Amino acid sequence: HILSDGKLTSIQTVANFMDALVTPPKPKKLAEQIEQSSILPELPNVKVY
Amino acid sequence: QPPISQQVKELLPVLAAQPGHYTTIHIHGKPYLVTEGDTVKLPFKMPGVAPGDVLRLNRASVIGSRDLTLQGAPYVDERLFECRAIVMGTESEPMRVMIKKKRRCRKKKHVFSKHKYTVLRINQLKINDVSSL
Amino acid sequence: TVKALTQISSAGRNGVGAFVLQCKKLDIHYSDWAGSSRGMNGFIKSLLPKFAAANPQIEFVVSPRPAKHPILMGHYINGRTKAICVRNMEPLEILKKAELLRDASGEKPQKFKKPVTSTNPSVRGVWSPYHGQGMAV
Amino acid sequence: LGQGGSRMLSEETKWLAVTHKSFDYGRRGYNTRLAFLGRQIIALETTRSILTSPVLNEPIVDKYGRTPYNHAALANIDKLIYTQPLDIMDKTKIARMGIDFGLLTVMRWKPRMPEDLESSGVVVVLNSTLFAIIGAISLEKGAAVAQRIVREKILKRLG
Amino acid sequence: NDRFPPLEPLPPAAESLPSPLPERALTSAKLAALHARLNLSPKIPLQTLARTLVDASADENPQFNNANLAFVGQTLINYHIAEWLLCKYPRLPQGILFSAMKAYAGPKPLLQIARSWGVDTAAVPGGEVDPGLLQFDALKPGVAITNFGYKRTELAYLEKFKWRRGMASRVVLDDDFGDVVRSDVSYDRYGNPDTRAAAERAHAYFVRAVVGAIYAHCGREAAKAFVKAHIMSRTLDIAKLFEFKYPTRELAALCAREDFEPPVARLLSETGRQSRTPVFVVGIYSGSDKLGEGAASSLDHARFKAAMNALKAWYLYSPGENPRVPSDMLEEGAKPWTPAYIDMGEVISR
Amino acid sequence: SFFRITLHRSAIGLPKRTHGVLAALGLRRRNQTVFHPVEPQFAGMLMKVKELVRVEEVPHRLTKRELKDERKPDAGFVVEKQVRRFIPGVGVQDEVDFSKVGAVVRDGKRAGDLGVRTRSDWEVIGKMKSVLPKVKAL
Ligand SMILES: [Mg+2]
């Protein structure tokens, strides 16, 4: 993982360092974002394509 | 509560025994002559109601059958009858444009009006037995 | 001799005995690229999950539709369809529009003419000049 | 109807149930309407005697190798695959019951050809009379009293 | 292809099955909405509601099909309406009774109850279709349910040679609506009057099945409430099922049977005689009592119409709008049963 | 006491000074009710518009929320049963029947917290293959 200087400067605590490394990029597609949601995938009457 | 008149207590069974009954309910002061099963389309959007909601109507000006008519002075006593409705959703009208204009003046002002209306369904209209009362 | 006719059936009155929400389906079309779908994307993540749980009798289908404005298309029991373009609307405006499709019926809009609609004959029958006290000119 | 049968119905009703539409050109009431309700009552009791009867059913092997849902509530409704109500409610079986209890010497009908009773509608005429007796008990005494008589005085005599 | 992956994950051996698998019903949004639309209790799983939507024309197997549920349901619907109709109008003529049973629990009204529930049909039955669609095969001619009525020995003659059937044997020999019993593929075609019947049949069997599932899972009392709410709530004008042949003669036989004095037609009012559209009001009077009244343009027609109104009043006599039903006794302890009125029968006259 | 003044007529064609008298009393539109203390200053104010208003002595002054509550018609209905709804700022309010009375609003970040039937609940109901209604009830 190559960390940017904008990140290293923003990092100030050990917890911030862990977040930058273990947090994968946020999904751009709303569909992949809905799969991670807890409510919508579980509802019986809702179907996401 | 005020006891019902003895004349209304002896003729109410004669009114409830006849085949059909109608009533004049009052929603916000406006009357609507209806019968069980009728569909009232109110000229306003009742706030805070969703389809499936049950409304109990308690302001009835007239309850009568073919030959007999029960009239309350301001309104009939709620203990005598039981009227209930159900909200069947809301409907709208086609947008209508009003053009306000004066002669020899090019400016035509437009007014767009598209109102919503709540629709009801009288699913219960029964006259109670007041022998106990 | 009485001969029974066999060409008349019973008519249903929704709301009497049982109620059936006229809205049976709701199509939610969004776009990840279109800028006009920014609010629709925020409605699907914050307000749709709970609104879809409050109406378990509606089939919600969320499908993408790039290169097109976002729309709410509600299918009704009578076979008709109502679509609403929600371009450039905020998430709370979409929830106000989805409540319009849920409370609405499949019928076409019509001007307000008469409040009551009854299919049951008059309790007091229609007037007749022959069933009263008469009239003298 | 067993002990107390005569008193359960009524003087007028008991005669009406046993009277067919072919007697006296219907000037005196007939049991046709009662026979309608009686059949509806009997059908719903023979359908319940197949659903609630404890029997070991052989499951069918689907050609496509599918597996059924196998719910305990649908196992009772899957009992109609082997025993159908009409197998129990046979015209000849129900008609034979009345002839055994002496219903042929009591009922009021006019056969078109008296000598050849069989070809004059004895089966159809006997079934309409046995349904009426059950259609009149229900209306006059309630379903609970009728449901006890269909399970004991009809179904228990037809296996 | 790679650009268009399948929307629904399914095995390769899924487009060949007659109907979707039971576990497929646990991932469809149409069933979950259909189950919540009818307010069915949670006792009925989704794997059971799916079976109600699979007609016996799409699946020959006794299980996975509507054959058994639709039977148990037809018996309940028919029984509950039969007892309610006899308690409400105890004097209905038998032919009219058959027409009124068919007007509530027949293929025609049951087709509208299914269309009021938002039930969309599948084009062609297959394992790929989602279980939330009513799936049947309308090109299969021989699909039918099992009925209690028997086949008539003279069935062929009745149709071909116009033999007489009768209305007293229909109760035993015929079905519950009086009708007689036993009365590759190319999709380049149009609808048929025979297919429309299969479409009506499939919808009716489904609505009957839903009642069969409610009875199996929720019990008897639940089924009666469902029938009372969705079927018996429909409105019908029974006065419009009447067709009279020589009503004046029939009315005379009525008064003679009940010992009422002979009926006499009297001209209550009239106007416009010797005009294009006169009005005559004649009232049929048995002694001093007035049985019925009718108004027509012709003097004879007014006398006929007045006789019909008197006969309709005799047959359409109702003790009450919401009468007690004999089925109310077998449930939890209720008030003792009171004998209901039993009419002799409709008058037979010349 | 107080003066209960109600503008019965208009002043569309009256002099401009008459509009200054109706502006000091507070009568903007027609049939508008105002309450002013009984005093010579107001009494001479009404002698200038006495052809347009209706005066009445009242014991106490009426508030803004009480002048409107005397022309308010009775609703004529009462909500006795409500169906499940989603309130944007509160949560998912369950069904309530006021005939047996319970507005319980469950909010959360999971479907289970909302109080609705989820897919897992439909799998638990589908595996209960032993549940059966009593023979007497069947
Ligand atoms: Mg001016």
Q: Phi, psi at residue D33, to the nearest 5°?
A: -65, -40
**Amino acid, res. B27:** I
Place of tokens 């003044």: F5
Binary contact (B58, F79; C-beta < 8 A): no
Residue D113 burial (10 A CB sphere; 0-12, 13-18, 19+): exposed
The alpha carbon of F43 and the centre of ligand 1 are apart by a number of angstroms equal to 28
DSSP letter assigned to residue E63: T
Nearest-angstrom CA–CA distance, E266 and E261: 15
Tell me the chain C residues in contact with residue B50 when contact means C-beta distances shorter than 8 Å.
Answer: 102-103
Show the DSSP H helices in A1-49 as ranges: 5-10, 14-22, 30-36
Nearest-angstrom CA–CA distance, D135 and D140: 9
Q: Judge contact between C44 and C69, C-beta under 8 A.
A: no
Place of tokens 């109500």: D85
Residue F85, SS3?
strand
Angstrom CA distances, F82 to B26, C90, D127, E230, F98, stand at 21, 28, 52, 21, 8
Nearest-angstrom CA–CA distance, E47 and C119: 39
Q: Which two tokens stand for residue A10?
A: 């923003």
Strands (E), C77-134: 81-85, 116-117
Q: Which two tokens stand for residue E311?
A: 């006969």
Q: Which two tokens stand for residue E247?
A: 């009503």
- Taking alpha carbons only, the member of E112, E212, B86 closest to residue C21 is B86
Contact C44/A at CB under 8 A:
yes
Instruction: Give, in degrees to the nearest 5, the angle at Cα D77 between D72 and D80.
Output: 140
Mutate to test the interface with B, among F70, F71, F74, F77 (most CBs of B within 10 A): F77
Strands (E), chain B: 22-27, 30-34, 39-40, 54-57, 60-64, 69-71, 81-92, 96-100, 109-113, 116-127
- What contacts F79, CB < 8 A, 6 or more positions away? B48, B49, B53, B54, B55, F98
Residue A44 burial (10 A CB sphere; 0-12, 13-18, 19+): buried
- Taking alpha carbons only, the member of C36, E173, F116, C5 closest to residue A39 is F116
Cα-Cα-Cα-Cα dihedral sign, residues B65, B71, B74, B78 = negative
Q: Judge contact between E179 and E151, C-beta under 8 A.
A: no
Cβ neighbours around D131 below 10 Å, total: 27
- Taking alpha carbons only, the member of D85, D100, D109, D86 closest to residue D32 is D109
Q: Please, which residues bridge with residue E282 across strands?
A: E267, E294
Bridge-based pairing state of the strands C2-4 and E279-286: unpaired
Nearest-angstrom CA–CA distance, B46 and B48: 7
Nearest by CB to C115, which of B40, B92, B123?
B40
The alpha carbon of F12 and the centre of ligand 1 are apart by a number of angstroms equal to 7
Q: Judge contact between E65 and E56, C-beta under 8 A.
A: yes
Show the DSSP H helices in B72-129 as ranges: none
The alpha carbon of F16 and the centre of ligand 1 are apart by a number of angstroms equal to 11
Return the H-helix or E-strand segment holding E290. Answer: strand E289-296
Residue D33 burial (10 A CB sphere; 0-12, 13-18, 19+): buried
Nearest by CB to C56, which of F88, F91, F117?
F117
Tell me the chain F residues in contact with residue B54 when contact means C-beta distances shorter than 8 Å.
Answer: 79-81
Tell me the chain D residues in contact with residue E216 when contact means C-beta distances shorter than 8 Å.
Answer: 51, 73-74, 76-77
The alpha carbon of F45 and the centre of ligand 1 are apart by a number of angstroms equal to 23
Nearest-angstrom CA–CA distance, F111 and F89: 17
b/e burial code for range F78-117 (CB count within 10 A of at least 16 → b):
ebbbbbbbbeeeebbbbebeeeeeeeeeeeeeebbebbbb
Q: Which two tokens stand for residue E215?
A: 């009875």
Binary contact (C59, A47; C-beta < 8 A): yes
Residue E94, SS3?
helix
Residue D98, SS3?
helix
b/e burial code for range E54-91 (CB count within 10 A of at least 16 → b):
bbbbbbebebbbbbbbbbbbbbbbbbbbbbbbbbbbbb
Nearest-angstrom CA–CA distance, D60 and D53: 19
Nearest-angstrom CA–CA distance, E240 and E252: 22
Rg over alpha carbons for chain F, rounded to the nearest Å, is: 31
Binary contact (C107, B91; C-beta < 8 A): yes
Bridge-based pairing state of the strands C23-30 and C59-64: parallel
Return the H-helix or E-strand segment holding D16. Answer: helix D11-17
Mutate to test the interface with E, among A32, A42, A46, A47 (most CBs of E within 10 A): A47
Length of chain E: 350
Q: Please, which residues bridge with residue C61 across strands?
A: A47, C27
**Amino acid, res. D156:** K
The alpha carbon of F19 and the centre of ligand 1 are apart by a number of angstroms equal to 12
Q: Which two tokens stand for residue D47?
A: 């359908």
- Taking alpha carbons only, the member of D125, D122, D91, C135 closest to residue E148 is D91
Chains A, F: CB contacts within 8 A come to: 21
- Taking alpha carbons only, the member of C47, C45, C46 closest to residue C97 is C47
Q: Judge contact between D127 and D95, C-beta under 8 A.
A: yes
